[PDB]
Amino acid sequence: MVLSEGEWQLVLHVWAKVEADVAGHGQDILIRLFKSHPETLEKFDRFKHLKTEAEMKASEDLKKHGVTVLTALGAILKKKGHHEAELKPLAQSHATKHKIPIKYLEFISEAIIHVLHSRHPGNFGADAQGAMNKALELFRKDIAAKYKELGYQG
Numbered sequence: 001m002v003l004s005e006g007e008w009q010l011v012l013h014v015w016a017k018v019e020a021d022v023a024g025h026g027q028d029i030l031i032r033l034f035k036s037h038p039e040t041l042e043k044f045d046r047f048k049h050l051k052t053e054a055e056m057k058a059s060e061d062l063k064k065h066g067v068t069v070l071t072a073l074g075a076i077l078k079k080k081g082h083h084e085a086e087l088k089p090l091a092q093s094h095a096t097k098h099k100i101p102i103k104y105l106e107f108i109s110e111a112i113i114h115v116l117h118s119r120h121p122g123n124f125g126a127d128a129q130g131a132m133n134k135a136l137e138l139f140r141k142d143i144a145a146k147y148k149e150l151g152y153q154g
């Protein structure tokens, strides 16, 4: 796939709003993912035990991980499609160490779009949401292709 420049602009314009509060968005997004798809919490041997949303909100470790995830995702989006380098180490650890199925990257893509929609309705109308979905599908497609080369296509 190839996004046009206008689509990238819509993606980087709402992302600049996320970046005003990286740790708060990270929390929202991971909690929305775990609530929606509790099976994904099992992949975290660190958080696994968190039983409620209140516990999740209070977990300092969870919030740090959220900042890690978003920082890496933001560095990938800012490349505007030229992200091969950034993807390599990410696809190797998720395919060999963590073992995250493509299906779970779709689930978090959904949680990212839900949260931007709630927190930025004015910078996240239909065209901007289509552009963000297109940028995340691109991301999932390049990752999936690297999974296959690494031997996982999981």
Ligand code: HEM
Binding pocket: 040, 041, 043, 044, 045, 046, 065, 068, 069, 070, 072, 073, 089, 090, 093, 094, 098, 100, 104, 105, 108
């Ligand atoms: C936008 C998608 C994602 C990005 C950009 C991302 C990024 C990262 C980064 C940068 C790290 C630390 C470095 C590393 O281990 O590679 C990480 C660790 C991890 N990620 Fe991903 N991740 C994403 C999605 C997921 C999803 C969907 C899950 C599972 C449901 C997941 C599970 C984990 C786990 C198990 C770790 C290790 C956490 C800890 O033990 O420290 N990741 N991820």
